[PDB]
Design a protein around this ligand. Structure first.
Ligand code: ADP
Ligand code: MG
Lengths: 96, 193, 325, 198
DNA sequence: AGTGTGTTTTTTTTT
DNA sequence: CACACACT
């Protein structure tokens, strides 16, 4: 019965997210970031909203989805760059 | 469910809810639970489509309950399947055709990924199993459907299944200083998808 | 009645442990550590069903890795020719039919598996370095969570894999390589040994001293004499108190619980040169190993509760399976 | 675990070549030992005789086994000693294992041994070189780490350095197996390709 | 005497 | 289609 919908969304938040995603794959400990990764983030937002059980996606639940995906990405990195990347994404992490 | 939904902190309780018998692993619990919930399927212009299922890639040290995590996952999402990984192959999991001597023609054999379709897909021992089979799985998952044209059978089967791969790090221990791709004995494209 | 009296006298006696060990097997190998491992695997542990879906295996996963020349081969022959419904695998050849899961047409059938013939009996396989990985994977899933199934087409019946397991592997070159240690002397993979709780290690040496006593022992053990009999317990009686030991199973007490958790911490210290004092070799799988080992210790006593003595003895078994490098 | 290993070598001396070739000539030209009686005789010897070991022959077995441990020795070789002694007791239908039975068992086995014992390619002298091989590989690893940055580096270059100075031309499969073995003890970490240090 | 009923290994193809 | 059997 539950089918949350992205009726409201944060376009530019995701935009800056994918921007930061860029110029990081240059790191030897960093795997490439592609469009399907962004679609992955979107579907993670959908999964979170379904988990919230509301028929409408919540912006902040989507924010937690962003947080989870970016944290997974950071964990995927080499620990040397991982600290620099976590500081860089800290501007995103606090919003969760 | 509605009453708990309006209750706040439900998300954290669900995170604690998934595989309670595995102490810790808060992020892992979050990931597997949200995979169980799964994304919303999206389709564009009828033909263009976006999967509503989540492919979880897991790297785990040996003895880290990965198989048991999968076992808790199943029986919770109703429709479920288990992929031994090494046991299945390209033909066995995705789509299989069986020659049927009793009927005297080639017949479809149940692809375990077709069994995965409509439900959650468990995947285990995948980092150790066959690479050509891995490419077959890539192909099948890319379209959320398996297309097979052999032995006179040109059928194509929808494969809507949230999959969760289980993997062991190179030597069983991930090195954080080591790049993930070097910590991974598998292909780059699979981690991308 | 005489059976009950034999049970009473043997449970009441002090050295109930290692008395059966001398009774068990030809005991031609004087170490007797392999034989007490055989004893514990006889007693093993009952499968555990948690409140969640994670039903914990009760059968301890043991290796008795040793040389084919050494007495382990004869010990396995003793076990298969004696222990009820036990499966013998030579090791040099592996046929999927003999393994746990196999496919036989006509309608459709399933070939008899080792564990079905085992009937919770130990996997008495030998030379695990010599069984093929294609046949090893049959037991990988089988010894994981006691689950036999086939990913291929067919009925793929869920054969009940609740069984004790004994690799009894023989390392590269047959003989032990002190350089290669307990781990890595062999093809058998890390995940499958990760399931394997304890190994009791392998040691092979010229052993000039043993050439005096145990070299003399072999002839008397095997020859016109062949009369070195050491059965402190009869075979029939042996099965009888095996049954009686299986009747009652110890459970951890609160003092025993604290004692065992502290002793697991000591194990963790013992696993130094790693993070967290890593469980690693003695993993959570091996935490289950200690629990079932404490159950099996004085299982012949049929004590209904686990005692710290059992935990300490299991710790000793761990150590004898650890320090060797 | 053979009872009595023999060695057949086609290394013939010039005079021995002359003698064997003359034996052939005799064979060529035609182109007391009953021979046939041996088959029925041995069948009846099997049906009649059941060899029994004597305590004196038992002690013969004792000190033969302990010496063969000293001069290492196999339990299967001991059971072979028993079989050879019983077979000698079978010869001449003496029905009883004798001391000289065990002594000829020993002499035949040792004569095969000289070809210490080197059974199953096991010599007490220079028994194992795996210590030196592992230490050489590890020393080459430290040399590479000093020469090349990072603990992990490509396997092809490792194959390059190992051959030039550290050791002879050897495949990297052995090094990878050794690294996996060390990882199984977690004293080192294994990769795959590349060799990372702990 | 009714009336019924029966006879013409190989070789690719997977994999 | 049409000819040897087994009773019809
Ligand atoms: N955090 C945890 N809490 C409880 N059990 C755990 C935890 N981590 C690992 N385990 C145990 O580890 C065991 C091994 O799980 P499995 O997935 O089969 O291991 P492997 O890592 O070899 O694939 C399971 O029986 C599970 O209960
Ligand atoms: Mg697992």
């Amino acid at each position: 019965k539950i089918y949350p919908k992205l009726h409201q969304m944060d376009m530019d938040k995701v935009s800056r997210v994918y921007a930061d995603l860029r110029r990081e794959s240059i790191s030897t400990g960093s795997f490439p970031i592609t469009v399907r990764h962004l679609e992955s983030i979107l579907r993670i937002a959908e999964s979170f909203a379904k988990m919230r059980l509301s028929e409408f996606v919540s912006s902040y639940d989507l924010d937690r989805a962003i947080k989870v995906v970016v944290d997974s990405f950071v964990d995927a990195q080499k620990v040397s760059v991982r600290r620099q990347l976590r500081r860089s994404f800290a501007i995103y992490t606090l919003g969760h | 469910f509605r009453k708990i939904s309006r209750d706040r902190g439900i998300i954290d309780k669900i995170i604690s809810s998934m595989a309670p018998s595995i102490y810790g692993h808060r992020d892992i619990k979050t990931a597997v639970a949200c995979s169980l919930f799964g994304g919303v399927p999206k389709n564009v212009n009828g033909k263009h489509s976006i999967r509503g299922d989540i492919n979880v890639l897991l790297l785990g040290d040996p003895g880290t309950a990965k198989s048991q995590i999968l076992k808790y996952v199943e029986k919770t999402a109703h429709r479920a399947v288990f992929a031994t990984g090494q046991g299945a192959s390209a033909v066995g999991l995705t789509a299989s055709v069986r020659k049927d001597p009793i009927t005297k023609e080639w017949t479809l054999e149940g692809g375990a990924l077709v069994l995965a379709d409509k439900g959650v897909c468990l995947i285990d021992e995948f980092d150790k199993m066959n690479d050509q089979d891995r490419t077959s799985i890539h192909e099948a998952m890319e379209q959320q459907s398996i297309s097979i044209s052999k032995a006179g059978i040109v059928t194509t089967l929808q494969a809507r299944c949230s999959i969760i791969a289980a993997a062991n790090p190179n030597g069983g221990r991930y090195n954080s200083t080591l790049p993930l791709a070097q910590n991974v004995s598998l292909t780059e494209p699979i981690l991308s998808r | 009645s005489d059976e009950i009296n034999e049970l009473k006298e043997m449970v009441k006696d002090e050295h109930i442990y290692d008395k059966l060990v001398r009774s068990i097997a030809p005991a031609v190998f004087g170490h007797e550590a392999v034989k007490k491992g055989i004893l514990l695997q006889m007693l093993g542990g009952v499968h555990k069903s948690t409140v969640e879906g994670i039903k914990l295996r009760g059968d301890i996963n043991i290796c008795v890795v040793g040389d084919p020349s050494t007495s382990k081969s004869q010990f396995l022959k003793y076990v298969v020719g004696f222990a009820p419904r036990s499966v013998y695998t030579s090791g040099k050849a592996s046929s999927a039919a003999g393994l746990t899961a196999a496919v036989v047409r006509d309608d459709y059938t399933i070939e008899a598996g080792a564990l079905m013939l085992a009937d919770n009996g130990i996997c008495c396989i030998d030379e695990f370095d010599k069984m093929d990985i294609s046949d090893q994977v049959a037991i990988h899933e089988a010894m994981e969570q006691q689950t036999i199934s086939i990913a291929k087409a067919g009925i793929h019946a869920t054969l009940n894999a609740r069984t004790s397991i004994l690799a009894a592997a023989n390392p590269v070159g047959g003989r032990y390589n002190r350089k290669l240690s307990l781990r890595g002397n062999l093809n058998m993979t890390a995940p499958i040994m990760s399931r394997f709780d304890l190994f009791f290690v392998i040691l092979d040496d010229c052993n000039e001293k043993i050439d005096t006593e145990l070299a003399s022992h072999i002839v008397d053990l095997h020859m016109k004499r062949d009369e070195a009999i050491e059965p402190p317990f009869s075979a029939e009686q042996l099965r009888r108190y095996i049954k009686y030991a299986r009747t009652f199973k110890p459970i951890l007490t609160k003092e025993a619980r604290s004692y065992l958790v502290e002793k697991y911490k000591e194990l963790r210290k013992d696993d130094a040169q790693g993070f967290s004092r890593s469980s690693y070799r003695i993993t959570v799988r091996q935490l289950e190993s200690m629990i079932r080992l404490s159950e099996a210790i004085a299982r012949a006593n049929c004590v209904d509760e686990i005692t710290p003595s059992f935990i300490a003895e299991a710790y000793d078994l761990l150590r004898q399976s650890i320090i060797r490098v | 675990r053979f009872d009595l290993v023999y060695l057949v070598l086609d290394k013939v001396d010039e005079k021995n070549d002359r003698e064997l070739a003359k034996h052939l000539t005799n064979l060529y030209l035609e182109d007391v030992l009953p021979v046939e009686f041996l088959t029925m005789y041995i069948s009846y010897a099997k049906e009649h005789i059941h060899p029994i070991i004597t305590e004196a022959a038992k002690t013969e077995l004792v000190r033969a086994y302990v010496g063969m441990r000293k001069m290492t020795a196999t339990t299967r070789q001991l059971e072979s000693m028993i079989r050879l002694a019983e077979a000698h007791a079978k010869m001449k239908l003496k029905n009883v294992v004798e001391l000289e039975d065990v002594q000829e068992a020993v002499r035949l086995i040792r004569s095969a041994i000289k070809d210490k014992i080197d059974m199953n390619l096991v010599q007490t002298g220079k028994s194992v070189i795996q210590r030196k091989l592992q230490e050489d590989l590890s020393r080459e690893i430290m040399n590479v780490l000093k020469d090349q940055a990072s603990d992990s580096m490509s396997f092809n270059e490792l194959i390059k350095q190992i051959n030039e100075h550290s050791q002879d031309r050897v495949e990297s499969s052995d090094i990878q197996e050794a690294l996996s073995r060390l990882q199984q003890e977690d004293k080192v970490i294994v990769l795959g390709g590349v060799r990372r240090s702990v």
